[PDB]
Amino acid sequence: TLVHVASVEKGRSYEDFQKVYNAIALKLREDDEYDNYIGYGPVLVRLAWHISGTWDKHDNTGGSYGGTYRFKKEFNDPSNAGLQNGFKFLEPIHKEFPWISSGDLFSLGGVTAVQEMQGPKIPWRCGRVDTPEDTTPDNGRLPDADKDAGYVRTFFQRLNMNDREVVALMGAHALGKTHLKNSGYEGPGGAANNVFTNEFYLNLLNEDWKLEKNDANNEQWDSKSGYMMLPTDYSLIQDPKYLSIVKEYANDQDKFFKDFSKAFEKLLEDGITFPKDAPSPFIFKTLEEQGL
Ligand code: HEM
Numbered sequence: 001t002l003v004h005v006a007s008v009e010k011g012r013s014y015e016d017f018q019k020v021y022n023a024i025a026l027k028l029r030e031d032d033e034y035d036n037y038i039g040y041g042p043v044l045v046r047l048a049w050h051i052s053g054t055w056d057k058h059d060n061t062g063g064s065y066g067g068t069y070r071f072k073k074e075f076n077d078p079s080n081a082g083l084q085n086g087f088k089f090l091e092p093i094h095k096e097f098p099w100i101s102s103g104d105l106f107s108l109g110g111v112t113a114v115q116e117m118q119g120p121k122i123p124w125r126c127g128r129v130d131t132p133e134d135t136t137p138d139n140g141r142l143p144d145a146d147k148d149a150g151y152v153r154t155f156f157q158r159l160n161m162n163d164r165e166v167v168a169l170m171g172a173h174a175l176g177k178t179h180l181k182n183s184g185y186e187g188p189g190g191a192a193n194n195v196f197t198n199e200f201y202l203n204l205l206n207e208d209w210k211l212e213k214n215d216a217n218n219e220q221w222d223s224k225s226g227y228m229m230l231p232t233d234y235s236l237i238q239d240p241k242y243l244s245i246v247k248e249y250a251n252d253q254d255k256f257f258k259d260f261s262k263a264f265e266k267l268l269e270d271g272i273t274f275p276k277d278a279p280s281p282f283i284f285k286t287l288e289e290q291g292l
Pocket residue numbers: 042043045046049081082143144145146152169170172173175176177178179180182183184185230232264
């Protein structure tokens with residue numbers, strides 16, 4: 001097992017990171033046209049997850065710590081097609097705040113996006129440190145979407161996530177959409193795809209899903225409302241253990257928010273050793289809470 005010890009960017013404290021948060025949040029508000037007016041929130045959430053989801057608990061390779069998405073091997077992972085948009089969004093932020101590590105920036109982008117989209121508070125810790133190009137994980141550690149519940153369950157064991165954590169994390173698929181050219185899947189999951197809600201679960205349960213083929217010749221579940229579910233999304237109502245948890249989150253928005261927050265923080269922190277005298281996690285104020 002590799003050890004990656006969090007090291008606070010020199011002399012920085014909460015206020016410095018709140019300024020970075022605010023710059024991301026202001027740019028989210030400004031650059032509103034992206035992806036037919038969805039805006040950049042969803043893609044920044046996906047970026048934070050994909051830079052974290054390379055982690056392997058068995059040897060501590062991958063994970064958010066090293067900021068390795070900046071290197072070509074990872075940037076060009078077919079699993080990451082489309083995330084270049086999130087990276088380009090963050091470039092002016094990094095230029096303004098060149099002191100933040102890449103992993104801190106990519107993970108903070110996700111936190112900022114969730115919160116600005118009216119999601120739960122996500123505590124966040126600084127101290128990821130850029131690591132060299134040879135530490136970039138090989139392609140193929142992110143999950144396939146054409147598979148079943150057993151695949152999902154097994155996949156997420158590598159990330160140390162249990163059934164509840166998996167079902168909670170998947171609720172992020174209320175955000176944004178699938179794009180045929182990126183992933184071979186097309187369409188949104190619901191009507192509210194740049195506001196963070198529990199609509200993924202409601203739509204799973206309440207829509208009439210039909211197994212269809214899309215224009216890339218892949219199967220996906222479609223509804224007459226114009227929404228879709230990936231096979232891995234739909235697996236959460238095929239498996240009886242997942243189904244129970246889907247029903248719980250469909251019926252309790254606060255529970256969903258609390259469980260998502262904990263699972264997302266955990267995802268973003270996997271692989272990182274925090275010294276006992278490290279700062280406590282930061283909880284950033286939204287622009288709205290600041291009157292900004
Ligand atoms: C079994 C696990 C998962 C699979 C197979 C999967 C698959 C996908 C696919 C195929 C897309 C569409 C990409 C595109 O065409 O642009 C997507 C989008 C997205 N995923 Fe996942 N995903 C998984 C888990 C997660 C998790 C755990 C999160 C975060 C907590 C997440 C967040 C997102 C977001 C926010 C988008 C929308 C991106 C956009 O609109 O640009 N996904 N996912």
